[PDB]
């Protein structure tokens, strides 16, 4: 089906506690495959998925150089942003950047992404045309002008349409037994009396990959959006994810409720009920 590659950079200043930390992690879909941390005893790009290990020393050296250079550049950028906002040298600040490429089920480039945030607020983003910028404010307008002057968009576009897709396609082939395998959720409904006249029905989805899933409750075939407690999808630690949806129902009315489950790994969408 569809696939993406993303790198996520986080650069965090910490005045009085050394120079800003730079961390980079790389993902294919919901699978992390590399990390780099400037605070590590000996900072180097390290593998985080078995299928990347087969890459040669040149790969690791090249990546490590890129991230070491980025460490320095992001420190400059933090200094620069502090200035753009007239901020004190006393506070900690964070730049985040995410970029990468999306492929459709045919392996074609669907779109590219390059987005940044400052202190968790959108700062600047490469537009879907991979040619123009959206700046959030007059500070980001300075970065925009700087990047417009240095032809940054053209460089990001070439990567996103080229290297990004080429390496994503390589990784997808090298890791095809996991990356191109959808594990369906194992699903069940639990029942927990809350009082004499109400009970919680909880619909569980366990052991699925990728993370994308839809879990809903219906009452008489109508969605219970407002009355459903839906927890955030959470990692199990073995690559898979877990989720549940719960509804409080009148005692005796349990069979009017249906849990509906959609996920890529399923031969067909599931309808479950509580089974006493």
């Amino acid at each position: 089906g569809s696939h993406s590659m993303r790198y996520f950079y986080t650069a965090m200043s910490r005045p009085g506690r050394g120079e800003p930390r730079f961390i980079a992690v790389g993902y294919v879909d919901d699978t992390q495959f590399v990390r780099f941390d400037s605070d590590a005893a000996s900072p180097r790009t390290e593998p985080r998925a078995p299928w990347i290990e087969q890459e040669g020393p040149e790969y690791w050296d090249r990546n490590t150089q890129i991230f070491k250079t980025n460490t320095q550049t992001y420190r400059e950028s933090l200094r620069n942003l502090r200035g753009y906002y007239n901020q004190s040298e006393a506070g900690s600040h964070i730049i985040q950047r995410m970029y990468g490429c999306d492929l459709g089920p045919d392996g074609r480039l669907l779109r590219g992404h390059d987005q940044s945030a400052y202190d968790g607020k959108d700062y600047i983003a490469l537009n879907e045309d991979l040619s123009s910028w959206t700046a959030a404010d007059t500070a980001a307008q300075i970065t925009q002008r700087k990047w417009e002057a240095a032809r940054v968009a053209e460089q990001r576009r070439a990567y996103l349409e080229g290297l990004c897709v080429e390496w994503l396609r390589r990784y997808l082939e090298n890791g095809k037994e996991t990356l191109q395998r959808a594990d369906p959720p194992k699903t069940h409904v639990t029942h927990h009396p809350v009082s004499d006249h109400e009970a919680t029905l909880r619909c569980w989805a366990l052991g699925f990959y990728p993370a994308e899933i839809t879990l809903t409750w219906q009452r008489d075939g109508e969605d219970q959006t407002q009355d459903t407690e839906l927890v955030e999808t959470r990692p199990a630690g073995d690559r898979t994810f877990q989720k549940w949806a719960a509804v409080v129902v009148p005692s005796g009315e349990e069979q009017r409720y249906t849990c509906h489950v959609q996920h890529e790994g399923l031969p067909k969408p599931l309808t479950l009920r509580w089974e006493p």
């Binding site: 986080t10 965090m12 955030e232 959470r234 630690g237 073995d238």
Partner: protein, 99 residues
Amino acid sequence: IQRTPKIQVYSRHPAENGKSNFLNCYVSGFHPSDIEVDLLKNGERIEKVEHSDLSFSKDWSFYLLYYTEFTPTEKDEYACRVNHVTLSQPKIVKWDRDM
């Protein structure tokens, strides 16, 4: 400017007393990224807990998974203790095997 963590405490595999498993504390939706997370057994901090590499969601909030090997039993109580700049005091969330 700041976002408080969501916290879930749960096991990797369905909990079966006397059977080794993994205890997970997933903290998410927080900003900035500095966060303190302990896993507790009967109120006592577990030593040697590992965690994932720092990453973030589409809304720029951070998430981390803290985990350790554990063998659930009938009596033993497990919890996750979280402190963040957004919290006055650490937040304790108990492990509940139905959650």
